[PDB]
Structures are given as C-alpha cells and as structure tokens.
Amino acid sequence: VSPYGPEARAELSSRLTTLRNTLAPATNDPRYLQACGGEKLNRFRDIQCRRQTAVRADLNANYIQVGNTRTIACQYPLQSQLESHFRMLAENRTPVLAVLASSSEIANQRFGMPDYFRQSGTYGSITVESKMTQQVGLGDGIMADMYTLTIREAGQKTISVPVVHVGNWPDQTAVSSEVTKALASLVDQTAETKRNMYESKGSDDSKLRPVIHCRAGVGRTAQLIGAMCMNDSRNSQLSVEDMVSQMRVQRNGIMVQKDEQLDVLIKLAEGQGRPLLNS
Numbered sequence: 001v002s003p004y005g006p007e008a009r010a011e012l013s014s015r016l017t018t019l020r021n022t023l024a025p026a027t028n029d030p031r032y033l034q035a036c037g038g039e040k041l042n043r044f045r046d047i048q049c050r051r052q053t054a055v056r057a058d059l060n061a062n063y064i065q066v067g068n069t070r071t072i073a074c075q076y077p078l079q080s081q082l083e084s085h086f087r088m089l090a091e092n093r094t095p096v097l098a099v100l101a102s103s104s105e106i107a108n109q110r111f112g113m114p115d116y117f118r119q120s121g122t123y124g125s126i127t128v129e130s131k132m133t134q135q136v137g138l139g140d141g142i143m144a145d146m147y148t149l150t151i152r153e154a155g156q157k158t159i160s161v162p163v164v165h166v167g168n169w170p171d172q173t174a175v176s177s178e179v180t181k182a183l184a185s186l187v188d189q190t191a192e193t194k195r196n197m198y199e200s201k202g203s204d205d206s207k208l209r210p211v212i213h214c215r216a217g218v219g220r221t222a223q224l225i226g227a228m229c230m231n232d233s234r235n236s237q238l239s240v241e242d243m244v245s246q247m248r249v250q251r252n253g254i255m256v257q258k259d260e261q262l263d264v265l266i267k268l269a270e271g272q273g274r275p276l277l278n279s
C-alpha cells in the first residue's frame, strides 16, 4: 500500500538488481570503453566506463544526466591519468570538483590514489597550483575541506576549479540523508557561484558540469549525484527507479553500490513525495 513500504522497496531492488546483473561487463564488451594497448585504464577491473558517454578515451569517466541534472562521474584518477584528468577539468570549466575519497584512502600508498588536489604539482605540460580555502562542517562530524586548483598550460587558458573534499566519508558506507543534503547543497552552491563568475564575463551542455569522484566512482559518488538530482527543481516526478537506472546505463551497473546508499536516496525521495517506482 505505502509507496515507500517493504513491498515497494523490494520491487525497486528487484528491478535494479536485474539491471546491474545485465550491465555487468563481458570481455571486450562493446558497451564499455576499452584500454589502449596495455596501459591500465580501469582502477578496478570490474568497474568500467560506459563507452557511449565516455568523456575522454584514456579516462574512466562519464557524462551523466539524471532527469535534467548534468554532471561527470569518474574514478579517482590513476597516477598516469593525471594530466588527462586535469585537461578534462579545465576543458569542462569545472564549476566544482567533489572528491568523496577519504584522507586515509589517499594517504595509504597501497591504494595508488595520488594526492593531486591538496598540493601543487606538474604533470606533463600542465602545472597545478593548489590553495586551501574554507572548511565546512556537514553534520555528524563529517567535514568538507575546500580548495581551489589553478590549472596552467602553455598556450591554454588558465582555469581555476573550486574543490569540495569530504575527507571523512568512509569507503563502502552511506552518510546520513541529512549529511547528504548538506553536502548536495554545498556542492550545488559552490558550482553556482563559479558558473555565475563565468556568466558575468560572457560564457555548452558538455561543459560547466560538476565533477564528482570517490574511489571507484560508483558508491559515494552515486549517492551524492542522486541527492543533487533531487535538489534540481526541473526533475519533478523523476522516480528513484529512473535516477538509478539512468546513472547505471550512463556509467556502469554498480552506480549506487550499497543498499544503505540506495536507502538514503529512498529516504530523500520520501521526504519530497517523490515516487520510488515507475508506472
């Protein structure tokens, strides 16, 4: 009876599970971006990049549109992908880069997660200057550390990108619906202030997209993108089924990895009177 009761939830999981299963990548899957002769592309072998929406041939990153909300979801860039990663950021005039990987993950060198935004560096012909800005508490002890990345390259227009780094959102978990809302708000506001700057100077659908990544770019990243989607007034009536199905067909079947992460999107939906299932 209740649109958010056990039966609705079970039906939703059922549909999404079949989707994840059928979206699993086969070897040399035509639906997924393939690596360039030996060079490692995917941080995680089974977490691939939908070819049709791929942003760059050498990155595991996808253009994503949930309803009307446009973003870019990617994996934490590998050491070898940094220059291409920075080029994507600059070419997109990235209004905000949201990093949900924890300080502990990036610090552990066994994870091969380069500390590319908290310190300056040079990658290929690109030089990056990192500058610390404000710190915003999101609730429940979760903290957002802000930065600005100035990307310089000979002959290219210099681009500065605001960074929102949630440094203590544990891998494989879901922060509360309340924290998720505070985060979505901060990310959206950060992006809007930047977009406004570009617009005030005289400004493309493929550009000015918020860029979000965690470790694999399918768990924490998906929870945030879903929350950002629900904060967009243009998505009235977009169901939870639609949101998740769209993220999955546009990146991979793992988008919204944990049941606890789906549960946050469901709770947020319930709070808005947003439907869970289609039909």
Ligand SMILES: O=[N+]([O-])c1ccc(O)c(OS(=O)(=O)O)c1
Pocket (backbone or CB within 6 Å): 044, 047, 171, 172, 214, 215, 216, 217, 218, 219, 220, 221, 254, 257
């Ligand atoms: O689904 N996975 O295979 C996967 C692997 C490593 C992660 O750290 C992770 O969690 S994620 O970074 O929030 O996406 C998810």
